[PDB]
Design an enzyme around this catalytic site. Structure first.
Site, short mmCIF file in Angstrom:
data_model
loop_
_atom_site.label_atom_id
_atom_site.label_comp_id
_atom_site.label_asym_id
_atom_site.label_seq_id
_atom_site.Cartn_x
_atom_site.Cartn_y
_atom_site.Cartn_z
N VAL A 38 52.68 45.01 32.61
CA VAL A 38 52.00 45.40 31.39
C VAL A 38 51.24 46.70 31.59
O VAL A 38 50.03 46.74 31.86
CB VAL A 38 51.10 44.25 30.82
CG1 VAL A 38 50.40 44.67 29.53
CG2 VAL A 38 51.95 43.01 30.58
N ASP A 39 52.01 47.75 31.60
CA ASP A 39 51.55 49.13 31.73
C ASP A 39 50.65 49.47 30.55
O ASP A 39 49.74 50.30 30.66
CB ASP A 39 52.78 50.05 31.67
CG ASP A 39 53.93 49.59 32.54
OD1 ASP A 39 54.50 48.50 32.25
OD2 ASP A 39 54.27 50.29 33.51
N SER A 40 50.94 48.82 29.43
CA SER A 40 50.26 48.98 28.17
C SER A 40 50.26 50.41 27.70
O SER A 40 51.30 50.91 27.29
CB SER A 40 48.87 48.32 28.16
OG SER A 40 48.17 48.65 26.96
N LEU A 41 49.16 51.11 27.85
CA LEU A 41 49.08 52.49 27.37
C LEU A 41 49.89 53.40 28.26
O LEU A 41 50.46 54.39 27.82
CB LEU A 41 47.63 53.01 27.26
CG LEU A 41 46.71 52.38 26.20
CD1 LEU A 41 47.37 52.35 24.83
CD2 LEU A 41 46.24 51.00 26.62
N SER A 42 49.99 53.01 29.50
CA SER A 42 50.74 53.76 30.47
C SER A 42 52.25 53.60 30.25
O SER A 42 53.04 54.36 30.78
CB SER A 42 50.33 53.34 31.87
OG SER A 42 48.93 53.48 32.02
#
Length: 81
Positions: A38-42
């Site tokens: 879950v890199d999310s924003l990355s």
């Protein structure tokens, strides 16, 4: 540029350097911000790199409108050459 498994494999190359997932883990029954680190924003750093990798161009809209890697591949593998 790559087929369904190869798309996923290519994706994981970047997801490994961004988040750090095993490049044997990310198979078709995966999702990005669910079944990965879950890199999310990355993950936006993933997709932007993935665009050029798979010869696609994925709008910011479609990115969040896709779900799994089996789902994401549909847009990618179809639009590429």
């Amino acid at each position: 540029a790559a087929t369904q498994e190869e798309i996923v494999a290519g994706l994981a190359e970047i997801v490994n350097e961004i988040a750090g997932i095993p490049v044997e883990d990310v198979k078709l029954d995966k999702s990005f911000t669910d079944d990965l680190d879950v890199d999310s924003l990355s993950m936006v750093e993933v997709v932007v790199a993935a665009e050029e990798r798979f010869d696609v161009k994925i709008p910011d809209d479609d990115v969040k409108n896709l779900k799994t890697v089996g789902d994401a591949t549909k847009y990618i593998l179809d639009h590429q050459a």
